[PDB]
Design an enzyme around this catalytic site. Sequence first.
Site, PDB file in Angstrom:
ATOM      1  N   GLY A 278     -38.812  70.985   4.847  1.00 46.88           N
ATOM      2  CA  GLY A 278     -40.749  70.739   4.916  1.00 46.88           C
ATOM      3  C   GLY A 278     -41.496  71.010   3.967  1.00 46.88           C
ATOM      4  O   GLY A 278     -41.325  70.189   2.996  1.00 46.88           O
ATOM      5  N   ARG A 279     -42.103  72.047   5.023  1.00 49.40           N
ATOM      6  CA  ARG A 279     -43.367  72.674   3.885  1.00 49.40           C
ATOM      7  C   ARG A 279     -43.085  73.682   2.639  1.00 49.40           C
ATOM      8  O   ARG A 279     -43.513  73.030   1.059  1.00 49.40           O
ATOM      9  CB  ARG A 279     -44.145  73.684   4.679  1.00 49.40           C
ATOM     10  CG  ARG A 279     -43.825  73.115   6.442  1.00 49.40           C
ATOM     11  CD  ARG A 279     -45.159  74.066   6.775  1.00 49.40           C
ATOM     12  NE  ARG A 279     -45.341  73.958   8.251  1.00 49.40           N
ATOM     13  CZ  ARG A 279     -45.785  73.861   9.224  1.00 49.40           C
ATOM     14  NH1 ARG A 279     -46.016  76.117   9.248  1.00 49.40           N
ATOM     15  NH2 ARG A 279     -45.516  73.701  10.434  1.00 49.40           N
ATOM     16  N   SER A 280     -41.989  74.385   2.862  1.00 52.20           N
ATOM     17  CA  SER A 280     -40.712  74.550   1.495  1.00 52.20           C
ATOM     18  C   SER A 280     -40.983  73.430   0.574  1.00 52.20           C
ATOM     19  O   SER A 280     -40.966  73.887  -0.638  1.00 52.20           O
ATOM     20  CB  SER A 280     -39.541  75.269   1.882  1.00 52.20           C
ATOM     21  OG  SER A 280     -39.663  76.201   2.595  1.00 52.20           O
TER      22      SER A 280
ATOM     23  N   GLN B 203     -39.892  66.108   5.033  1.00 53.75           N
ATOM     24  CA  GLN B 203     -39.159  66.338   6.831  1.00 53.75           C
ATOM     25  C   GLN B 203     -39.820  64.705   6.676  1.00 53.75           C
ATOM     26  O   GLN B 203     -38.784  64.252   8.274  1.00 53.75           O
ATOM     27  CB  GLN B 203     -39.148  66.878   7.598  1.00 53.75           C
ATOM     28  CG  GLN B 203     -38.403  67.921   7.137  1.00 53.75           C
ATOM     29  CD  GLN B 203     -38.346  69.155   7.942  1.00 53.75           C
ATOM     30  OE1 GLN B 203     -39.319  70.097   7.791  1.00 53.75           O
ATOM     31  NE2 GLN B 203     -37.136  69.414   8.934  1.00 53.75           N
TER      32      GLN B 203
ATOM     33  N   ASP C  99     -50.315  72.627  13.312  1.00 57.29           N
ATOM     34  CA  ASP C  99     -49.230  72.441  14.400  1.00 57.29           C
ATOM     35  C   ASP C  99     -48.200  71.352  14.664  1.00 57.29           C
ATOM     36  O   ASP C  99     -47.009  71.105  14.128  1.00 57.29           O
ATOM     37  CB  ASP C  99     -49.682  73.053  16.165  1.00 57.29           C
ATOM     38  CG  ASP C  99     -49.287  74.559  16.074  1.00 57.29           C
ATOM     39  OD1 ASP C  99     -49.192  75.228  15.105  1.00 57.29           O
ATOM     40  OD2 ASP C  99     -49.589  74.441  17.189  1.00 57.29           O
TER      41      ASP C  99
ATOM     42  N   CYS D 125     -40.061  78.242   5.510  1.00 61.05           N
ATOM     43  CA  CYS D 125     -41.133  77.558   6.570  1.00 61.05           C
ATOM     44  C   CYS D 125     -40.129  78.148   7.735  1.00 61.05           C
ATOM     45  O   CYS D 125     -39.469  79.378   7.801  1.00 61.05           O
ATOM     46  CB  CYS D 125     -41.262  76.977   6.546  1.00 61.05           C
ATOM     47  SG  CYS D 125     -40.351  75.002   5.967  1.00 61.05           S
TER      48      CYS D 125
END
Length: 284
Positions: A220-222, A262, A181, A215
């Site tokens: 960000g994660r992507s 990000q 998280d 995401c």
Amino acid sequence: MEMEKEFEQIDKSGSWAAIYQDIRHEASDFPSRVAKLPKNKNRNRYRDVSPFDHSRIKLHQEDNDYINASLIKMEEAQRSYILTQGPLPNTVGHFWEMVWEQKSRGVVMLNRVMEKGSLKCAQYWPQKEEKEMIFEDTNLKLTLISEDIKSYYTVRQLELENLTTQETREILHFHYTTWPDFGVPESPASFLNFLFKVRESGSLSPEHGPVVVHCSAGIGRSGTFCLADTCLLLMDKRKDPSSVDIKKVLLEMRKFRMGLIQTADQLRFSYLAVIEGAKFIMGD
Ligand SMILES: O=S1(=O)c2ccccc2[C@@H](O)CN1CCO
């Protein structure tokens, strides 16, 4: 400069925030006029994350062709990716329309439906075989065929039917379920294992349309997933792996979608993943 030495130099100097802001400063700025039209306000999850006009995916319909999704085309690496937001209650039918129209084989999901006690994306796929989903606005049917639940990720087989033509296709859903998280994973080992499972499936290969990756915001994660994949591929095809510049690859990718990576901790995690992944690529 060997990125592993660049890495230790930034870590010992604690300059991750400074490197990250330099990327933010040099990144491309292109218009996103279609994203900002009043008719499209409920098609955007976040007011500050929009696809550029030049690279946006168009839906094949005369009514409204808009979806918050971008085509990232990597010329040398010979890879393409569609990066998109997590679907909204009113865009789940658009989402599956795009997968159908672009001929994608795979969907990569890097978030949970609920994180930090808030909804990060719609429940857009069926959870039980005998309870299929129908998207009446786009005329599609989606059925869960099988599910393989592992410690760090789940893989699902889905059947997507164009109800207009009765054609069907098998879509593979790759769900990374353990991104924390807050912050980034401590080791990139489980993220690299996941990347290698998506590659093994055929989902990233030129015989299919581009993989759909998301995401919550799709940056960000992507961004971390496509940056790591492209950098490792360039290390493989090149005579000198040491010439692969992660900061320059990221700036190229930011010509096609804003905001990719990000945080400074996402930048450092991307370096760690590529450095640890290369110890396979170079023959181990
Ligand atoms: O192929 S790249 O992603 C790449 C690879 C290795 C080192 C630097 C770079 C960048 O120039 C961006 N790219 C395409 C435009 O030149």
